[PDB]
Amino acid sequence: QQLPIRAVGEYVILVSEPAQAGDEEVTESGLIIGKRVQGEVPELCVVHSVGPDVPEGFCEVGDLTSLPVGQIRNVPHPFVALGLKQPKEIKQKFVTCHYKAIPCLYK
Amino acid sequence: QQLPIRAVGEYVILVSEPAQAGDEEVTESGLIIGKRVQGEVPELCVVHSVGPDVPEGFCEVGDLTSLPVGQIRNVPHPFVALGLKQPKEIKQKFVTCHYKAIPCLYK
Amino acid sequence: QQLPIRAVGEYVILVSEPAQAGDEEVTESGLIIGKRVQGEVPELCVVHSVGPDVPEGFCEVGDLTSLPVGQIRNVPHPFVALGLKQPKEIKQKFVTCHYKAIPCLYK
Amino acid sequence: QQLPIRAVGEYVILVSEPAQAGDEEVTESGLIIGKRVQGEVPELCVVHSVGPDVPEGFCEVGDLTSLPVGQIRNVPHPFVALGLKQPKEIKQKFVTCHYKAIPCLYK
Amino acid sequence: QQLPIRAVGEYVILVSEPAQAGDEEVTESGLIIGKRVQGEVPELCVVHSVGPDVPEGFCEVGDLTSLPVGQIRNVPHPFVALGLKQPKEIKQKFVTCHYKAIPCLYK
Amino acid sequence: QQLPIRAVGEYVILVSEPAQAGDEEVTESGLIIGKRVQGEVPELCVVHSVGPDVPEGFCEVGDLTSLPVGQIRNVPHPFVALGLKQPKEIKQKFVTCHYKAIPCLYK
Amino acid sequence: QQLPIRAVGEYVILVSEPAQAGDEEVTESGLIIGKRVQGEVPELCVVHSVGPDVPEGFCEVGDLTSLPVGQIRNVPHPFVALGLKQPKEIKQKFVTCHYKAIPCLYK
Numbered sequence: 001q002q003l004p005i006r007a008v009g010e011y012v013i014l015v016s017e018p019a020q021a022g023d024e025e026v027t028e029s030g031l032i033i034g035k036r037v038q039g040e041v042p043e044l045c046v047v048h049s050v051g052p053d054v055p056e057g058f059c060e061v062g063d064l065t066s067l068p069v070g071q072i073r074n075v076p077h078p079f080v081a082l083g084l085k086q087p088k089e090i091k092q093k094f095v096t097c098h099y100k101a102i103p104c105l106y107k
Numbered sequence: 108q109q110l111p112i113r114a115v116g117e118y119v120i121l122v123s124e125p126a127q128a129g130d131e132e133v134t135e136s137g138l139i140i141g142k143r144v145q146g147e148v149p150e151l152c153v154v155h156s157v158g159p160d161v162p163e164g165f166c167e168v169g170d171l172t173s174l175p176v177g178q179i180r181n182v183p184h185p186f187v188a189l190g191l192k193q194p195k196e197i198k199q200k201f202v203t204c205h206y207k208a209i210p211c212l213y214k
Numbered sequence: 215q216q217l218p219i220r221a222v223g224e225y226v227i228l229v230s231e232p233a234q235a236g237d238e239e240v241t242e243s244g245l246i247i248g249k250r251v252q253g254e255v256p257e258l259c260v261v262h263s264v265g266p267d268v269p270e271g272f273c274e275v276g277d278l279t280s281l282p283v284g285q286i287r288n289v290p291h292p293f294v295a296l297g298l299k300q301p302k303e304i305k306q307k308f309v310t311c312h313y314k315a316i317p318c319l320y321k
Numbered sequence: 322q323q324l325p326i327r328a329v330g331e332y333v334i335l336v337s338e339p340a341q342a343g344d345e346e347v348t349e350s351g352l353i354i355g356k357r358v359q360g361e362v363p364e365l366c367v368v369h370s371v372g373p374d375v376p377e378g379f380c381e382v383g384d385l386t387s388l389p390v391g392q393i394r395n396v397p398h399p400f401v402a403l404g405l406k407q408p409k410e411i412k413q414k415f416v417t418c419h420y421k422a423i424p425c426l427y428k
Numbered sequence: 429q430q431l432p433i434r435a436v437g438e439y440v441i442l443v444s445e446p447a448q449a450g451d452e453e454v455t456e457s458g459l460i461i462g463k464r465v466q467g468e469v470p471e472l473c474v475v476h477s478v479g480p481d482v483p484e485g486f487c488e489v490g491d492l493t494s495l496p497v498g499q500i501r502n503v504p505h506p507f508v509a510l511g512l513k514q515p516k517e518i519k520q521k522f523v524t525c526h527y528k529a530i531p532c533l534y535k
Numbered sequence: 536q537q538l539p540i541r542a543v544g545e546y547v548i549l550v551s552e553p554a555q556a557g558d559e560e561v562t563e564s565g566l567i568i569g570k571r572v573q574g575e576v577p578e579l580c581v582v583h584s585v586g587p588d589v590p591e592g593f594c595e596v597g598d599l600t601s602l603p604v605g606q607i608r609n610v611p612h613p614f615v616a617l618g619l620k621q622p623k624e625i626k627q628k629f630v631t632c633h634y635k636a637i638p639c640l641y642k
Numbered sequence: 643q644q645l646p647i648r649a650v651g652e653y654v655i656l657v658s659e660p661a662q663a664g665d666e667e668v669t670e671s672g673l674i675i676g677k678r679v680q681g682e683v684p685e686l687c688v689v690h691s692v693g694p695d696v697p698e699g700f701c702e703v704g705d706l707t708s709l710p711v712g713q714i715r716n717v718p719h720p721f722v723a724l725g726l727k728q729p730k731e732i733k734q735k736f737v738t739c740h741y742k743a744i745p746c747l748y749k
């Protein structure tokens with residue numbers, strides 16, 4: 001899992017899971033969805049890196065958790081950052097958030 | 108009573124109670140309910156897990172409490188998270204909130 | 215006076231008084247009252263339980279005080295919470311608020 | 322002057338003075354006055370009780386001061402609170418505010 | 429300069445200067461001036477009293493400074509406060525502000 | 536360079552530079568510029584005085600820096616303040632800001 | 643890689659990378675882009691200078707990172723600042739941000 005990307009300070013870098021609840025487009029088509037609603041949607045992620053300032057024993061790499069879309073921020077894939085590839089050809093999605101935004105671990 | 112899901116930091120994971128306020132829908136039908144009102148509605152829940160940073164002796168697993176819908180956030184059922192179940196066939200509702208949002212225990 | 219409900223942390227649980235100044239029904243009928251105004255209305259209450267984190271010697275059970283409606287939050291009666299009574303058949307009204315919202319005691 | 326009402330925490334209970342800005346009613350009748358303006362009007366008050374958490378030597382009972390209407394909150398007269406008298410037949414007006422809202426003393 | 433009015437806590441009481449920026453009335457008449465603009469106008473004042481909680485050596489009585497109208501608050505003249513004169517016959521204007529709002533001294 | 540004006544507390548007094556990037560008025564005439572945009576524009580300034588509470592070794596008088604217009608506040612020239620000159624005959628523009636608003640020095 | 647510009651306090655000065663997200667001009671022409679969206683766009687940068695108050699071992703000069711456009715602020719190029727060149731003939735873009743806004747390093 002280790003690529004050239006590390007979390008600093010009190011941040012934590014996670015990697016989004018391939019499957020998320022969105023495979024239930026049960027909602028009527030052509031509806032306008034507000035930003036609050038979109039921000040509440042949970043995102044299943046796996047801890048990839050923990051900032052050196054996150055309190056010791058907070059979580060561990062490999063741990064699975066859930067964060068609302070609105071609490072996390074997308075981080076450019078290290079290859080795109082290191083100018084090797086194009087965003088489109090990257091499947092893995094890295095996101096970040098402050099450790100205090102993490103409420104649980106499916107551990 | 109426990110499942111593979113634990114609270115971290117200062118968070119607390121509760122499990123919502125079967126019966127709640129919703130029963131009295133004897134209100135006039137077709138009225139638009141604001142978000143503040145909806146956020147006010149209390150939710151009866153039972154403590155399932157207490158984050159390691161919640162001050163010692165704050166509460167105990169099994170304790171029943173009440174939180175406004177607006178103070179808690181829904182957490183994906185560990186089963187759905189661990190990819191075995193579809194949220195639809197899940198009855199137990201897990202929610203989370205910061206410990207400072209808990210004002211009382213029905214003990 | 216003590217029912218099976220206790221305040222936790224820095225919260226305080228009070229019990230509203232039977233009579234409130236809501237006897238001044240001398241307001242012109244059919245007027246729309248704003249939320250700020252409604253939130254300003256005082257509520258006479260009696261301390262029923264003090265959270266363990268409220269500084270020692272802050273107040274005592276039985277003490278009468280006044281809080282603006284907007285500063286307190288209604289708490290489900292322990293009977294309703296413990297699924298023994300129906301809300302409608304409950305007279306006592308329990309409310310909660312952070313101790314820092316309490317400015318005085320009528321003692 | 323001292324009735325059964327005491328200030329707690331960092332609050333201070335004052336008693337409004339009989340004469341206030343309410344005399345200069347030279348302002349054009351029929352004008353709608355905003356809430357900011359109304360909140361700016363000073364209110365002359367006398368310290369009646371100082372919360373035990375207000376820093377020692379901050380002020381003394383009997384001290385006269387001035388607070389903007391928007392910084393203070395009306396407190397029910399102890400007799401109305403103690404259900405001994407009615408609001409209409411009460412002359413003394415008690416108000417409260419946090420000690421940090423007090424900028425001066427007319428001493 | 430010293431009348432019966434003292435600053436408490438971290439506040440500072442100043443006395444506004446006779447001539448201010450306003451003299452430059454060369455702008456177009458009948459223009460509606462916003463509140464942000466008005467709040468930015470500087471006010472030349474002289475320190476009259478320093479609260480006991482303002483850090484030692486912050487400033488001295490007699491010191492001249494400048495504060496934006498929006499940062500200071502008018503304080504009733506002690507003669508009006510002590511009920512001897514109607515504000516109209518008062519020329520000295522006292523104002524207050526927190527010490528952290530003071531950026532400089534003209535000395 | 537030292538005029539009779541000193542910074543107090545955590546403030547810093549700077550003097551604006553004669554030239555700023557406003558020597559690029561190629562912008563289409565008659566356009567309405569928002570406040571956010573205007574507040575963004577950098578201002579080149581030279582440190583004239585450092586408040587006694589600004590941490591030691593933060594910066595030095597004479598140091599050149601850049602601050603967004605929206606982060607600084609204009610300060611009346613000591614000559615206008617000391618009633619020695621009308622504003623119009625003053626070229627030097629003194630400004631102030633909190634030290635935490637300063638991100639760099641061109642030294 | 644160092645010119646005459648240094649970061650002070652808790653700030654960090656970075657230098658933007660030549661290639662950025664702007665390469666995918668696939669966005670339908672003539673669409674108005676909101677400010678939130680624009681502020682979210684990541685900007686790849688290289689640490690050029692770390693303020694003396696940024697905690698030791700936070701990052702190192704030369705380190706590559708990613709920051710949302712809305713978190714960073716453009717800093718005038720030292721030569722424009724030192725009145726040695728024109729902004730138009732300057733290629734290198736310097737930006738600044740508080741260290742707490744940095745979530746990762748591509749190390």
Ligand SMILES: [K+]
Nearest residue numbers: 030031032033
């Ligand atoms: K849509």
Ligand SMILES: [K+]
Nearest residue numbers: 034035036142
């Ligand atoms: K909305």
Ligand SMILES: [K+]
Nearest residue numbers: 137138139140
């Ligand atoms: K509805």
Ligand SMILES: [K+]
Nearest residue numbers: 244245246247
């Ligand atoms: K009504």
Ligand SMILES: [K+]
Nearest residue numbers: 351352353354
């Ligand atoms: K009116």
Ligand SMILES: [K+]
Nearest residue numbers: 458459460461
């Ligand atoms: K006007």
Ligand SMILES: [K+]
Nearest residue numbers: 462463464570
């Ligand atoms: K406006």
Ligand SMILES: [K+]
Nearest residue numbers: 565566567568
């Ligand atoms: K214009």
Ligand SMILES: [K+]
Nearest residue numbers: 569570571677
């Ligand atoms: K706008």
Ligand SMILES: [K+]
Nearest residue numbers: 672673674675
């Ligand atoms: K556009």
Ligand SMILES: [K+]
Nearest residue numbers: 035676677678
């Ligand atoms: K919008």
